[PDB]
Amino acid sequence: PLESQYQVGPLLGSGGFGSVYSGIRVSDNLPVAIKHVEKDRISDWGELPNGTRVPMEVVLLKKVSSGFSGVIRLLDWFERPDSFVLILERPEPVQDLFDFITERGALQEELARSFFWQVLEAVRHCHNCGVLHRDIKDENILIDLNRGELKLIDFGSGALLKDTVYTDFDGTRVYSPPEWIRYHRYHGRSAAVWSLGILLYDMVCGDIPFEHDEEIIRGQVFFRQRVSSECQHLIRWCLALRPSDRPTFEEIQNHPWMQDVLLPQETAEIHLH
Ligand SMILES: Cc1[nH]nc2cnc(-c3cccnc3)cc12
């Protein structure tokens, strides 16, 4: 009986994903986030192990939730007559990467290196668990300001990871690869790398590199900020027009720009406190 198990607070945000509120677990005052999603608005349905009809989002969240704190964990969920309700963990204090970039402008490379690495680790974690996120971007990353740790949120556009083609996509267009725009087909990992290339550019330039389909399709990267050559190179690499020309996760993290990352705690002490 959820209404009495959590104390609902202010609304945090709403959109295609639905509506998300601040809340507190009544038992221990654990800070939580309470997400509501309308059944009619749910395009993708999944099967629970015990065989149940449920939003794919819940399926993916269960698969990725455990010790690794690179992803935001699903604590519980409930079915309502016309909606599902998800209880998710909530860091406090917290701020999303989009708001942070808007606040702070372009980020220092040292800090961008830490953040990007943390994301890479998290995305690698989902892939390890058979989950593909499909909407990696600043708005879908949270920053625990005290610990300097980044957390992935919003698995509402995700899918089970597979090695065959995807012919559906419903994440953010300006973050989608050339081959989606052109052919409406992509492969999971190589698409994810492209979006990672967008995200990295966004961290270091304070903005997204492409706005229209034709810019995406052309794939020429102009840098509007001072950015090291290594970083430019890594970014150009992730944004290769041919998917098979993109680096693997291992190649990204072995890149020279990616060397000597700060620990999250260091990161907070230096860049966050
Ligand atoms: C502020 C916050 N803490 N824990 C969260 C989990 N999820 C979300 C979220 C935001 C947008 C869409 N879906 C989930 C937001 C969250």
Side-chain angles (χ1 to χ4, degrees), residues 1-72 74-273:
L2 81 79
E3 308 82 16
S4 63
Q5 218 183 321
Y6 302 91
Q7 196 39 68
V8 187
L11 185 75
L12 296 164
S14 76
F17 57 81
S19 300
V20 187
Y21 297 82
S22 192
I24 303 292
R25 182 155 71 190
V26 148
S27 81
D28 59 24
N29 313 107
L30 188 66
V32 296
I34 302 172
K35 180 174 180 168
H36 300 256
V37 67
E38 303 216 17
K39 296 201 201 177
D40 333 59
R41 202 178 36 197
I42 302 172
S43 323
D44 286 36
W45 292 83
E47 282 285 341
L48 232 27
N50 49 285
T52 321
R53 186 158 179 85
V54 130
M56 182 54 59
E57 186 174 0
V58 182
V59 172
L60 309 165
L61 285 167
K62 297 195 145 176
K63 294 164 77 81
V64 294
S65 302
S66 55
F68 175 70
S69 93
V71 197
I72 214 102
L74 180 73
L75 300 170
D76 199 10
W77 65 272
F78 314 103
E79 177 174 1
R80 238 117 88 129
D82 298 301
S83 65
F84 285 83
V85 181
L86 315 186
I87 314 310
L88 295 140
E89 70 190 8
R90 171 171 60 86
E92 174 49 28
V94 77
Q95 185 181 41
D96 78 32
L97 178 54
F98 174 89
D99 285 341
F100 183 90
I101 296 309
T102 298
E103 188 152 295
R104 185 165 309 205
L107 301 182
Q108 285 163 43
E109 290 194 35
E110 167 179 89
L111 167 61
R113 173 177 312 115
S114 166
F115 281 8
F116 190 70
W117 183 268
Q118 294 194 49
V119 173
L120 283 158
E121 297 284 339
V123 170
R124 264 232 268 155
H125 168 77
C126 304
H127 293 175
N128 266 136
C129 295
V131 175
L132 192 71
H133 188 284
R134 290 161 119 199
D135 194 23
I136 303 165
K137 56 167 172 173
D138 56 11
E139 293 175 79
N140 283 335
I141 287 142
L142 289 179
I143 301 171
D144 174 352
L145 300 170
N146 294 155
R147 295 179 184 288
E149 303 174 0
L150 273 56
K151 295 193 168 243
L152 237 45
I153 55 156
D154 195 359
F155 285 75
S157 316
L160 307 302
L161 182 55
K162 66 182 185 192
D163 296 318
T164 59
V165 232
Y166 293 81
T167 44
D168 72 284
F169 170 83
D170 195 49
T172 319
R173 194 179 180 84
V174 292
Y175 274 87
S176 71
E179 57 280 15
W180 165 252
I181 307 298
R182 292 182 52 96
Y183 311 120
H184 295 313
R185 37 197 293 137
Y186 60 98
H187 292 260
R189 295 170 175 279
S190 80
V193 169
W194 172 274
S195 70
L196 289 166
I198 303 294
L199 168 81
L200 181 53
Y201 184 93
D202 183 48
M203 282 177 195
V204 305
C205 287
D207 204 0
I208 239 66
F210 309 132
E211 211 231 282
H212 309 112
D213 289 6
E214 28 289 313
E215 296 174 323
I216 301 184
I217 285 169
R218 179 160 184 252
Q220 262 294 151
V221 167
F222 164 90
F223 281 90
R224 59 185 91 194
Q225 294 283 335
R226 163 64 192 197
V227 175
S228 67
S229 299
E230 321 257 5
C231 187
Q232 286 200 25
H233 171 272
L234 175 57
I235 284 165
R236 281 158 197 301
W237 204 6
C238 301
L239 294 177
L241 280 175
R242 295 192 135 300
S244 73
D245 288 334
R246 301 182 195 141
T248 60
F249 296 117
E250 181 190 8
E251 299 186 294
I252 295 176
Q253 300 185 288
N254 278 333
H255 192 281
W257 181 74
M258 210 78 266
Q259 274 340 289
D260 287 342
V261 68
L262 300 177
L263 302 175
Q265 204 44 87
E266 275 153 350
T267 301
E269 286 173 331
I270 300 185
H271 293 282
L272 262 30
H273 294 354

mmCIF file of all heavy atoms in Angstrom, residues 12 17 20 32-33 35 57 72 88-91 94 140 142 153-155, ligand 1:
data_model
loop_
_atom_site.group_PDB
_atom_site.id
_atom_site.type_symbol
_atom_site.label_atom_id
_atom_site.label_comp_id
_atom_site.label_asym_id
_atom_site.label_seq_id
_atom_site.Cartn_x
_atom_site.Cartn_y
_atom_site.Cartn_z
ATOM 1 N N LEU A 12 9.690 16.611 -9.474
ATOM 2 C CA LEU A 12 11.042 16.872 -9.962
ATOM 3 C C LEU A 12 11.102 17.117 -11.472
ATOM 4 O O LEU A 12 11.903 17.915 -11.948
ATOM 5 C CB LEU A 12 11.959 15.714 -9.588
ATOM 6 C CG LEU A 12 12.117 15.553 -8.075
ATOM 7 C CD1 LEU A 12 12.686 14.195 -7.731
ATOM 8 C CD2 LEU A 12 12.990 16.672 -7.507
ATOM 9 N N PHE A 17 8.879 10.556 -20.551
ATOM 10 C CA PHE A 17 9.117 9.505 -19.565
ATOM 11 C C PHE A 17 7.964 9.357 -18.560
ATOM 12 O O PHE A 17 7.737 8.264 -18.031
ATOM 13 C CB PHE A 17 10.437 9.739 -18.828
ATOM 14 C CG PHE A 17 10.528 11.079 -18.148
ATOM 15 C CD1 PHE A 17 9.935 11.285 -16.899
ATOM 16 C CD2 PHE A 17 11.220 12.133 -18.748
ATOM 17 C CE1 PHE A 17 10.026 12.519 -16.267
ATOM 18 C CE2 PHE A 17 11.315 13.376 -18.124
ATOM 19 C CZ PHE A 17 10.720 13.567 -16.875
ATOM 20 N N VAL A 20 7.922 12.455 -12.255
ATOM 21 C CA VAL A 20 8.823 11.969 -11.215
ATOM 22 C C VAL A 20 8.824 12.900 -10.001
ATOM 23 O O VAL A 20 9.072 14.107 -10.135
ATOM 24 C CB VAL A 20 10.280 11.826 -11.737
ATOM 25 C CG1 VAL A 20 11.162 11.149 -10.688
ATOM 26 C CG2 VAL A 20 10.322 11.062 -13.042
ATOM 27 N N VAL A 32 14.043 8.934 -1.874
ATOM 28 C CA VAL A 32 13.676 8.162 -3.056
ATOM 29 C C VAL A 32 13.086 9.042 -4.145
ATOM 30 O O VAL A 32 12.763 10.211 -3.924
ATOM 31 C CB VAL A 32 12.646 7.062 -2.733
ATOM 32 C CG1 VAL A 32 13.242 6.053 -1.786
ATOM 33 C CG2 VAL A 32 11.369 7.680 -2.149
ATOM 34 N N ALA A 33 12.956 8.468 -5.332
ATOM 35 C CA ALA A 33 12.325 9.162 -6.439
ATOM 36 C C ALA A 33 11.165 8.277 -6.834
ATOM 37 O O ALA A 33 11.296 7.064 -6.865
ATOM 38 C CB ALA A 33 13.327 9.382 -7.621
ATOM 39 N N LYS A 35 8.423 7.545 -9.694
ATOM 40 C CA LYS A 35 8.099 7.760 -11.098
ATOM 41 C C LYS A 35 6.745 7.139 -11.455
ATOM 42 O O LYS A 35 6.452 5.996 -11.099
ATOM 43 C CB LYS A 35 9.204 7.168 -11.978
ATOM 44 C CG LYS A 35 8.971 7.341 -13.475
ATOM 45 C CD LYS A 35 10.191 6.853 -14.273
ATOM 46 C CE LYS A 35 9.989 7.008 -15.787
ATOM 47 N NZ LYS A 35 11.245 6.821 -16.568
ATOM 48 N N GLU A 57 10.747 -1.040 -19.096
ATOM 49 C CA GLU A 57 11.609 -0.270 -18.211
ATOM 50 C C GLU A 57 11.894 -1.036 -16.912
ATOM 51 O O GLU A 57 13.032 -1.036 -16.418
ATOM 52 C CB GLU A 57 11.004 1.116 -17.931
ATOM 53 C CG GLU A 57 11.893 2.060 -17.122
ATOM 54 C CD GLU A 57 11.316 3.484 -16.995
ATOM 55 O OE1 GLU A 57 10.216 3.762 -17.525
ATOM 56 O OE2 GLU A 57 11.979 4.336 -16.366
ATOM 57 N N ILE A 72 21.248 3.898 -11.407
ATOM 58 C CA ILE A 72 20.299 4.210 -10.363
ATOM 59 C C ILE A 72 19.340 3.067 -10.151
ATOM 60 O O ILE A 72 18.621 2.713 -11.051
ATOM 61 C CB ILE A 72 19.571 5.542 -10.657
ATOM 62 C CG1 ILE A 72 19.261 6.296 -9.386
ATOM 63 C CG2 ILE A 72 18.311 5.364 -11.474
ATOM 64 C CD1 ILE A 72 20.220 7.421 -9.151
ATOM 65 N N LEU A 88 12.652 4.535 -6.939
ATOM 66 C CA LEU A 88 14.027 4.534 -7.336
ATOM 67 C C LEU A 88 14.821 5.235 -6.284
ATOM 68 O O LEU A 88 14.289 5.995 -5.542
ATOM 69 C CB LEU A 88 14.178 5.251 -8.656
ATOM 70 C CG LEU A 88 13.495 4.582 -9.823
ATOM 71 C CD1 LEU A 88 12.841 5.592 -10.708
ATOM 72 C CD2 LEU A 88 14.464 3.748 -10.607
ATOM 73 N N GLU A 89 16.110 4.975 -6.226
ATOM 74 C CA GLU A 89 16.942 5.600 -5.229
ATOM 75 C C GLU A 89 17.183 7.015 -5.618
ATOM 76 O O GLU A 89 17.035 7.356 -6.751
ATOM 77 C CB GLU A 89 18.220 4.816 -4.986
ATOM 78 C CG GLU A 89 19.239 4.825 -6.086
ATOM 79 C CD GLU A 89 20.354 3.833 -5.851
ATOM 80 O OE1 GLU A 89 20.262 3.043 -4.919
ATOM 81 O OE2 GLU A 89 21.331 3.846 -6.598
ATOM 82 N N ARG A 90 17.478 7.861 -4.656
ATOM 83 C CA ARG A 90 17.691 9.258 -4.945
ATOM 84 C C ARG A 90 18.838 9.789 -4.155
ATOM 85 O O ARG A 90 18.819 9.776 -2.952
ATOM 86 C CB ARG A 90 16.447 10.071 -4.668
ATOM 87 C CG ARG A 90 16.672 11.550 -4.752
ATOM 88 C CD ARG A 90 15.386 12.318 -4.678
ATOM 89 N NE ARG A 90 14.681 12.075 -3.439
ATOM 90 C CZ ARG A 90 14.892 12.724 -2.308
ATOM 91 N NH1 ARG A 90 15.792 13.662 -2.239
ATOM 92 N NH2 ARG A 90 14.192 12.418 -1.251
ATOM 93 N N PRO A 91 19.858 10.255 -4.850
ATOM 94 C CA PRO A 91 20.988 10.892 -4.170
ATOM 95 C C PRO A 91 20.592 12.290 -3.721
ATOM 96 O O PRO A 91 19.691 12.893 -4.304
ATOM 97 C CB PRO A 91 22.069 10.962 -5.265
ATOM 98 C CG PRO A 91 21.601 10.045 -6.352
ATOM 99 C CD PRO A 91 20.108 10.086 -6.290
ATOM 100 N N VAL A 94 21.895 16.270 -5.228
ATOM 101 C CA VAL A 94 22.080 15.739 -6.560
ATOM 102 C C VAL A 94 21.815 16.827 -7.592
ATOM 103 O O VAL A 94 21.082 17.780 -7.325
ATOM 104 C CB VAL A 94 21.110 14.565 -6.801
ATOM 105 C CG1 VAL A 94 19.713 15.099 -7.069
ATOM 106 C CG2 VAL A 94 21.582 13.724 -7.953
ATOM 107 N N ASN A 140 20.099 12.466 -18.667
ATOM 108 C CA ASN A 140 19.918 11.129 -18.151
ATOM 109 C C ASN A 140 21.114 10.636 -17.372
ATOM 110 O O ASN A 140 21.381 9.479 -17.305
ATOM 111 C CB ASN A 140 19.604 10.191 -19.293
ATOM 112 C CG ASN A 140 18.200 10.318 -19.771
ATOM 113 O OD1 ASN A 140 17.350 10.721 -19.042
ATOM 114 N ND2 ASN A 140 17.959 9.954 -20.978
ATOM 115 N N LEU A 142 22.919 11.544 -13.521
ATOM 116 C CA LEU A 142 22.834 12.285 -12.296
ATOM 117 C C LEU A 142 24.159 12.333 -11.623
ATOM 118 O O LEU A 142 24.894 11.410 -11.678
ATOM 119 C CB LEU A 142 21.847 11.648 -11.349
ATOM 120 C CG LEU A 142 20.371 11.714 -11.653
ATOM 121 C CD1 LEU A 142 19.610 10.996 -10.579
ATOM 122 C CD2 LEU A 142 19.904 13.129 -11.792
ATOM 123 N N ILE A 153 20.189 7.223 -15.463
ATOM 124 C CA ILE A 153 18.758 7.179 -15.152
ATOM 125 C C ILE A 153 17.917 7.088 -16.413
ATOM 126 O O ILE A 153 18.412 7.318 -17.523
ATOM 127 C CB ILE A 153 18.281 8.425 -14.364
ATOM 128 C CG1 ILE A 153 18.655 9.700 -15.127
ATOM 129 C CG2 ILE A 153 18.870 8.438 -12.964
ATOM 130 C CD1 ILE A 153 17.784 10.913 -14.789
ATOM 131 N N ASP A 154 16.647 6.759 -16.270
ATOM 132 C CA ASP A 154 15.669 6.715 -17.352
ATOM 133 C C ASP A 154 15.859 5.626 -18.374
ATOM 134 O O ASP A 154 16.268 5.868 -19.471
ATOM 135 C CB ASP A 154 15.531 8.061 -18.034
ATOM 136 C CG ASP A 154 14.297 8.174 -18.907
ATOM 137 O OD1 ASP A 154 13.521 7.245 -19.049
ATOM 138 O OD2 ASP A 154 14.105 9.240 -19.456
ATOM 139 N N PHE A 155 15.523 4.413 -18.014
ATOM 140 C CA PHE A 155 15.653 3.315 -18.954
ATOM 141 C C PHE A 155 14.377 3.122 -19.786
ATOM 142 O O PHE A 155 14.136 2.047 -20.329
ATOM 143 C CB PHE A 155 16.045 2.032 -18.223
ATOM 144 C CG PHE A 155 17.499 1.995 -17.780
ATOM 145 C CD1 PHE A 155 17.933 2.739 -16.684
ATOM 146 C CD2 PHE A 155 18.424 1.201 -18.447
ATOM 147 C CE1 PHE A 155 19.262 2.702 -16.268
ATOM 148 C CE2 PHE A 155 19.761 1.150 -18.021
ATOM 149 C CZ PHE A 155 20.179 1.902 -16.941
HETATM 150 C C1 LIG B 1 16.436 13.001 -9.220
HETATM 151 C C2 LIG B 1 16.350 11.488 -9.272
HETATM 152 N N1 LIG B 1 16.803 10.699 -8.331
HETATM 153 N N2 LIG B 1 16.593 9.356 -8.686
HETATM 154 C C3 LIG B 1 15.989 9.336 -9.920
HETATM 155 C C4 LIG B 1 15.564 8.312 -10.758
HETATM 156 N N3 LIG B 1 15.014 8.573 -11.921
HETATM 157 C C5 LIG B 1 14.825 9.817 -12.353
HETATM 158 C C6 LIG B 1 14.197 9.951 -13.691
HETATM 159 C C7 LIG B 1 14.230 11.164 -14.397
HETATM 160 C C8 LIG B 1 13.632 11.202 -15.655
HETATM 161 C C9 LIG B 1 13.031 10.053 -16.157
HETATM 162 N N4 LIG B 1 13.028 8.919 -15.468
HETATM 163 C C10 LIG B 1 13.581 8.834 -14.271
HETATM 164 C C11 LIG B 1 15.213 10.922 -11.585
HETATM 165 C C12 LIG B 1 15.813 10.686 -10.325
#
